[PDB]
Scaffold this motif. Structure first.
Motif, PDB file in Angstrom:
ATOM      1  N   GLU A   1       0.975  -1.139  -0.013  1.00 39.82           N
ATOM      2  CA  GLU A   1       0.098  -0.063  -0.052  1.00 39.82           C
ATOM      3  C   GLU A   1       0.878   1.137  -0.025  1.00 39.82           C
ATOM      4  OE1 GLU A   1      -3.688   0.214   2.321  1.00 39.82           O
ATOM      5  OE2 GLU A   1      -2.843   1.870   3.614  1.00 39.82           O
ATOM      6  N   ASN A   2       0.663   2.188  -0.964  1.00 37.63           N
ATOM      7  CA  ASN A   2       1.410   3.134  -0.668  1.00 37.63           C
ATOM      8  C   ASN A   2       0.710   4.395  -0.112  1.00 37.63           C
ATOM      9  OD1 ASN A   2       0.527   4.942  -4.042  1.00 37.63           O
ATOM     10  ND2 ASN A   2      -0.752   4.082  -2.576  1.00 37.63           N
ATOM     11  N   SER A   3       1.260   5.602  -0.012  1.00 40.04           N
ATOM     12  CA  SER A   3       0.551   6.777   0.737  1.00 40.04           C
ATOM     13  C   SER A   3      -0.643   7.178   0.425  1.00 40.04           C
ATOM     14  CB  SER A   3       1.517   8.114   0.241  1.00 40.04           C
ATOM     15  OG  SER A   3       2.356   8.137  -0.507  1.00 40.04           O
ATOM     16  N   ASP A   4      -1.114   6.887  -1.055  1.00 42.59           N
ATOM     17  CA  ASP A   4      -2.355   6.886  -1.516  1.00 42.59           C
ATOM     18  C   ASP A   4      -2.876   5.378  -1.180  1.00 42.59           C
ATOM     19  OD1 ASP A   4      -1.476   9.411  -2.785  1.00 42.59           O
ATOM     20  OD2 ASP A   4      -0.586   8.150  -4.230  1.00 42.59           O
ATOM     21  N   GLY A   5      -4.217   5.453  -1.312  1.00 41.48           N
ATOM     22  CA  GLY A   5      -4.735   3.993  -1.183  1.00 41.48           C
ATOM     23  C   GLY A   5      -4.159   2.738  -1.510  1.00 41.48           C
ATOM     24  N   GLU A   6      -3.603   2.773  -2.707  1.00 40.48           N
ATOM     25  CA  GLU A   6      -2.827   2.025  -3.583  1.00 40.48           C
ATOM     26  C   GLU A   6      -1.953   0.636  -3.250  1.00 40.48           C
ATOM     27  OE1 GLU A   6      -2.929   4.023  -7.573  1.00 40.48           O
ATOM     28  OE2 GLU A   6      -1.229   4.770  -6.631  1.00 40.48           O
ATOM     29  N   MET A   7      -2.400  -0.400  -3.944  1.00 43.56           N
ATOM     30  CA  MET A   7      -1.459  -1.702  -3.412  1.00 43.56           C
ATOM     31  C   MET A   7      -0.611  -1.807  -4.754  1.00 43.56           C
ATOM     32  SD  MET A   7      -2.456  -2.631  -0.552  1.00 43.56           S
ATOM     33  CE  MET A   7      -1.697  -3.965  -0.366  1.00 43.56           C
ATOM     34  N   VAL A   8       0.436  -1.152  -4.677  1.00 39.73           N
ATOM     35  CA  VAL A   8       1.354  -1.192  -5.716  1.00 39.73           C
ATOM     36  C   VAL A   8       2.289  -2.508  -5.788  1.00 39.73           C
ATOM     37  CG1 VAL A   8       1.431   1.216  -5.581  1.00 39.73           C
ATOM     38  CG2 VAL A   8       3.089   0.147  -4.791  1.00 39.73           C
ATOM     39  N   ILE A   9       2.538  -2.746  -6.965  1.00 43.44           N
ATOM     40  CA  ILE A   9       3.506  -4.056  -7.243  1.00 43.44           C
ATOM     41  C   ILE A   9       4.498  -3.714  -8.606  1.00 43.44           C
ATOM     42  CG2 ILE A   9       3.267  -6.112  -9.068  1.00 43.44           C
ATOM     43  CD1 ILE A   9       0.544  -6.646  -6.804  1.00 43.44           C
ATOM     44  N   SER A  10       5.700  -4.453  -8.348  1.00 43.60           N
ATOM     45  CA  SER A  10       6.440  -3.885  -9.477  1.00 43.60           C
ATOM     46  C   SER A  10       6.117  -4.627 -10.857  1.00 43.60           C
ATOM     47  CB  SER A  10       7.911  -4.379  -9.210  1.00 43.60           C
ATOM     48  OG  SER A  10       8.461  -3.966  -7.818  1.00 43.60           O
ATOM     49  N   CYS A  11       6.048  -3.781 -12.028  1.00 42.08           N
ATOM     50  CA  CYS A  11       5.762  -4.173 -13.374  1.00 42.08           C
ATOM     51  C   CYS A  11       6.542  -5.136 -13.653  1.00 42.08           C
ATOM     52  CB  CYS A  11       5.607  -3.317 -14.237  1.00 42.08           C
ATOM     53  SG  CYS A  11       4.294  -1.964 -13.682  1.00 42.08           S
ATOM     54  N   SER A  12       8.088  -5.159 -13.406  1.00 45.98           N
ATOM     55  CA  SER A  12       8.784  -6.151 -13.804  1.00 45.98           C
ATOM     56  C   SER A  12       8.723  -7.446 -12.900  1.00 45.98           C
ATOM     57  CB  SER A  12      10.136  -5.456 -13.222  1.00 45.98           C
ATOM     58  OG  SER A  12      10.190  -4.372 -13.954  1.00 45.98           O
ATOM     59  N   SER A  13       7.966  -7.637 -11.831  1.00 48.40           N
ATOM     60  CA  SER A  13       7.784  -8.904 -11.394  1.00 48.40           C
ATOM     61  C   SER A  13       6.572  -9.919 -11.851  1.00 48.40           C
ATOM     62  CB  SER A  13       7.706  -8.735  -9.874  1.00 48.40           C
ATOM     63  OG  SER A  13       6.417  -7.925  -9.812  1.00 48.40           O
ATOM     64  N   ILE A  14       5.800  -9.223 -12.703  1.00 47.35           N
ATOM     65  CA  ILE A  14       4.547 -10.169 -13.339  1.00 47.35           C
ATOM     66  C   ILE A  14       4.787 -11.542 -13.589  1.00 47.35           C
ATOM     67  CG2 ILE A  14       3.227  -9.894 -15.332  1.00 47.35           C
ATOM     68  CD1 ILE A  14       2.864  -6.900 -14.709  1.00 47.35           C
ATOM     69  N   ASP A  15       5.772 -11.695 -14.486  1.00 49.57           N
ATOM     70  CA  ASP A  15       5.980 -13.032 -14.917  1.00 49.57           C
ATOM     71  C   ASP A  15       6.511 -14.000 -13.852  1.00 49.57           C
ATOM     72  OD1 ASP A  15       5.561 -11.917 -17.784  1.00 49.57           O
ATOM     73  OD2 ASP A  15       7.424 -11.445 -17.889  1.00 49.57           O
ATOM     74  N   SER A  16       6.847 -13.847 -12.807  1.00 52.24           N
ATOM     75  CA  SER A  16       7.038 -14.760 -11.650  1.00 52.24           C
ATOM     76  C   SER A  16       5.919 -15.010 -10.944  1.00 52.24           C
ATOM     77  CB  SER A  16       8.364 -13.875 -10.885  1.00 52.24           C
ATOM     78  OG  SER A  16       7.564 -13.013  -9.809  1.00 52.24           O
ATOM     79  N   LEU A  17       4.705 -14.323 -11.102  1.00 47.13           N
ATOM     80  CA  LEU A  17       3.530 -14.782 -10.341  1.00 47.13           C
ATOM     81  C   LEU A  17       2.664 -15.917 -10.893  1.00 47.13           C
ATOM     82  CD1 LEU A  17       2.874 -11.048  -9.655  1.00 47.13           C
ATOM     83  CD2 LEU A  17       4.081 -12.457  -8.031  1.00 47.13           C
ATOM     84  N   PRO A  18       1.923 -16.481 -10.075  1.00 43.00           N
ATOM     85  CA  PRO A  18       1.113 -17.627 -10.337  1.00 43.00           C
ATOM     86  C   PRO A  18      -0.068 -17.182 -10.695  1.00 43.00           C
ATOM     87  CG  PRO A  18       0.934 -17.145  -7.946  1.00 43.00           C
ATOM     88  CD  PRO A  18       1.873 -16.164  -8.382  1.00 43.00           C
ATOM     89  N   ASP A  19      -0.969 -18.001 -11.290  1.00 42.51           N
ATOM     90  CA  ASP A  19      -2.288 -17.710 -11.539  1.00 42.51           C
ATOM     91  C   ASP A  19      -3.096 -17.968 -10.481  1.00 42.51           C
ATOM     92  OD1 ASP A  19      -1.317 -17.696 -14.281  1.00 42.51           O
ATOM     93  OD2 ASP A  19      -2.558 -19.458 -15.116  1.00 42.51           O
ATOM     94  N   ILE A  20      -4.351 -17.544 -10.333  1.00 41.47           N
ATOM     95  CA  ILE A  20      -5.258 -17.594  -9.375  1.00 41.47           C
ATOM     96  C   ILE A  20      -6.558 -18.356 -10.296  1.00 41.47           C
ATOM     97  CG2 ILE A  20      -6.277 -15.244  -9.844  1.00 41.47           C
ATOM     98  CD1 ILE A  20      -7.336 -15.473  -6.648  1.00 41.47           C
ATOM     99  N   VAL A  21      -7.139 -19.301  -9.981  1.00 45.45           N
ATOM    100  CA  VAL A  21      -8.032 -20.065 -10.570  1.00 45.45           C
ATOM    101  C   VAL A  21      -9.348 -20.283  -9.551  1.00 45.45           C
ATOM    102  CG1 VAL A  21      -8.466 -22.227 -11.754  1.00 45.45           C
ATOM    103  CG2 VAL A  21      -6.208 -21.211 -11.705  1.00 45.45           C
ATOM    104  N   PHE A  22     -10.328 -19.592 -10.644  1.00 47.74           N
ATOM    105  CA  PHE A  22     -11.915 -19.555 -10.047  1.00 47.74           C
ATOM    106  C   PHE A  22     -12.469 -20.977 -10.739  1.00 47.74           C
ATOM    107  CE2 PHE A  22     -12.414 -15.465  -7.886  1.00 47.74           C
ATOM    108  CZ  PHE A  22     -11.115 -14.931  -8.481  1.00 47.74           C
ATOM    109  N   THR A  23     -13.269 -21.673  -9.861  1.00 54.54           N
ATOM    110  CA  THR A  23     -13.921 -23.105 -10.300  1.00 54.54           C
ATOM    111  C   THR A  23     -15.369 -22.399 -10.070  1.00 54.54           C
ATOM    112  OG1 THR A  23     -11.844 -24.473  -9.899  1.00 54.54           O
ATOM    113  CG2 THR A  23     -14.464 -25.458 -10.129  1.00 54.54           C
ATOM    114  N   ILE A  24     -15.778 -22.582 -11.361  1.00 56.90           N
ATOM    115  CA  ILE A  24     -17.327 -22.394 -11.473  1.00 56.90           C
ATOM    116  C   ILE A  24     -18.027 -23.564 -12.130  1.00 56.90           C
ATOM    117  CG2 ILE A  24     -19.201 -20.747 -12.140  1.00 56.90           C
ATOM    118  CD1 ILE A  24     -16.998 -18.315 -12.448  1.00 56.90           C
ATOM    119  N   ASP A  25     -19.101 -23.878 -11.484  1.00 58.93           N
ATOM    120  CA  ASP A  25     -19.879 -25.224 -12.048  1.00 58.93           C
ATOM    121  C   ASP A  25     -18.971 -26.019 -12.676  1.00 58.93           C
ATOM    122  OD1 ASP A  25     -22.368 -26.257 -12.358  1.00 58.93           O
ATOM    123  OD2 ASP A  25     -22.277 -25.552 -14.507  1.00 58.93           O
ATOM    124  N   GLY A  26     -17.789 -26.365 -12.071  1.00 57.14           N
ATOM    125  CA  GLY A  26     -17.013 -27.242 -12.381  1.00 57.14           C
ATOM    126  C   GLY A  26     -15.956 -27.038 -13.487  1.00 57.14           C
TER     127      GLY A  26
END
Lengths: 370, 370
Positions: free
Chosen positions: A283-308
């Motif tokens: 969270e920065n000084s403003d409301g914001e949950m900032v992330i480094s743009c450069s780290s995107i490729d190292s993150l995992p996917d989040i999976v929503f399961t709907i009606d199987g």
């Protein structure tokens, strides 16, 4: 086909940040998105009736009256009323906004019915009137709508929209005013009792609200149909949420609301804090949950399961990239203790999955965007 | 002597008129001054918490904190709280106003007590804090005051004042915060438990709030003392109102409130309409009851009888003369049906009669200005 083009614009939050007005607001108010969906969660201090629209990013145009007066509106599946500011709105916040002048329209019909509109963080009042609304080339005659007259909060001043056009069920409509989609269908103005939303990628132009149709050009594969679990909002049942194979929330199933009025995935505070830490958001000084743009490729996917069926969101989808500035597409909320686990599937979700809202059969259909 | 100089400035109403903002307001709201004095008469639409200050014309300065932060305030005998805008007031209306920054004062002490201030036409909320208030050269230590944080209505933007300093009894103080005068007396900071108001003629400079004293230099003759009939506001009993020998209102006696927060004589709608027609006043497009300046000399005096002494008001006194523009100093109100006839003696009255507010003996003293 009846298409309403949508334009991606900088949100109200982005505008408050830019004007240095947000830190103060946050200092004196607790923002709880759950207030948009539950009476019980309504704001302690209702002085900013439009607080739940801080993160909206897509807007469309509608014309009202004869000849038509144009307005920029939010196409909101999370609400059901249509309202625009009245020319009688004297508030400083109403300045610089398109305003409806009833005396300029030869088809306007006033009513003495008062409108009280609230999205859980204060009310706005005005009056209800009838006029012809031009939406997607269709002339929606005898449409009841609200004319906002009282103080709308300072946030209206910085908002990229003039009003809101609700796409939810009539059961949550304030003053029982008939929603626009219901009026369209009752009049035989649309092909079928359904609408679909296509959000183009990377703030491109190409996004549309498709009234009365489904277009195979916007998705790949087959459409998965899910029943509406509670009619009011476009609410469905979620089976689980996993991250890197692990169940991280909605264990044993939960509810989800499909809301085009917000760009974020919103869920329980605790589950969200877990995720933010896992993705390195801060969270920065403003409301914001900032992330480094450069780290995107190292993150995992989040999976929503709907009606199987599995609906993965890759980091590029759940991370908002504003030139060299990246923010987390997750936000937390506190729902009534009464209430079970609830997630809000906003634009991050919809931009990846073309969505169909079927009022005839009370179902939502989903498919990966083409 | 402790004197607080007062300056006569163009009212909030005059500023709304000038900015073309008043007609719209009046179109969507019913203004009833009685709402400042009776809970029962509170506004249907509370979006402009400062509506009852449209006609205030005199203001003074106070400093708050260490070192002092200056603010322009209304010295209001019709209220009892002290409040100024907080630096955390993010509203557009708070712009261009002096704001208190608690972090700039080494003697400020925060409390977690919330302030809810209302003058009958909506609320403003904030928090209560303690600091040293500089008033008339006196250091009023450990004074509790409110810090306004929420939307104050667009009227604050056009107001020539930043806050209000109430001079009424503690029984009408919101949140039981102690009024400034009570704090002064409790601390032995003033000579006597009384204050007096002298308003100079023709928007001259020379007007003052005299804390703890009576000055024979401002009046002629002897002071007539009248008991406070109901302790809350500075309320007394009126014996009758005559115009050209004829009784025109308060037949058999009535109540009157002495209110420095308004420039007008306010009374029952019906009695006021009678008078306006008798003096040739006519409502213009803006709210205004205009009168021809050239007709002043042809009007009769209005006489208030108090505790058997006659208090005449000549046309020059009851007609407000803004260079070549003249307006009626009368305004109407609708009090709860419960309630008896009530008149508000504002600046038109006080400019002619030096007034003494005696808290030790619960009396008001009056004498013709010198």
């Amino acid at each position: 086909l009846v298409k309403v083009p949508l334009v991606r614009k900088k949100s109200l939050r982005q505008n408050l940040i830019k004007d240095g007005k947000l830190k103060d607001f946050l200092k004196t108010h607790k923002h709880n998105p759950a207030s948009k969906y539950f009476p019980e969660a309504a704001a302690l201090i209702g002085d900013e009736p439009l607080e739940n629209y801080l993160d909206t990013e897509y807007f469309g145009t509608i014309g009202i009256g004869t000849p038509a007066q144009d307005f920029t509106v939010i196409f909101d599946t999370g609400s059901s009323n249509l309202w625009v500011p009245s020319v009688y709105c004297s508030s400083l916040a109403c300045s610089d906004h398109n305003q409806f002048n009833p005396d300029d329209s030869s088809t306007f019909e006033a009513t003495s019915q008062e409108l009280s509109i609230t999205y859980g963080t204060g009310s706005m009042t005005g009056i209800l009137g009838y006029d012809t609304v031009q939406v997607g080339g269709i002339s929606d005659t005898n449409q009841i709508f609200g004319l906002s007259e009282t103080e709308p909060g300072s946030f209206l001043y910085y908002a990229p929209f003039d009003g809101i056009l609700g796409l939810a069920y009539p059961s949550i409509s304030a003053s029982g005013a008939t929603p626009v989609f219901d009026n369209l269908w009752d009049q035989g103005l649309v092909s079928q009792d359904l609408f679909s939303v296509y959000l183009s990628s990377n703030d491109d132009s190409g996004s549309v609200v498709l009234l009365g149709g489904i277009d195979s050009s916007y998705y790949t594969g087959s459409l998965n149909w899910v029943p509406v679990s509670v009619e009011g909002y476009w609410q469905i049942t979620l089976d689980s949420i996993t991250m890197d194979g692990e169940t991280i929330a909605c264990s044993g199933g939960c509810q989800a609301i499909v809301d085009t009025g917000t760009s974020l995935l919103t869920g329980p505070t605790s589950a969200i804090a877990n995720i933010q830490s896992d993705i390195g958001a801060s969270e920065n000084s403003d409301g914001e949950m900032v992330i480094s743009c450069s780290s995107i490729d190292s993150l995992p996917d989040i999976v929503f399961t709907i009606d199987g069926v599995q609906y993965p969101l890759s980091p590029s989808a759940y991370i908002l990239q504003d030139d060299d500035s990246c923010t987390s597409g997750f936000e937390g909320m506190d729902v009534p203790t009464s209430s079970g686990e609830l997630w809000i599937l906003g634009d991050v979700f919809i931009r990846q999955y073309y969505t169909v809202f079927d009022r005839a059969n009370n179902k939502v259909g989903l498919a990966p965007v083409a």
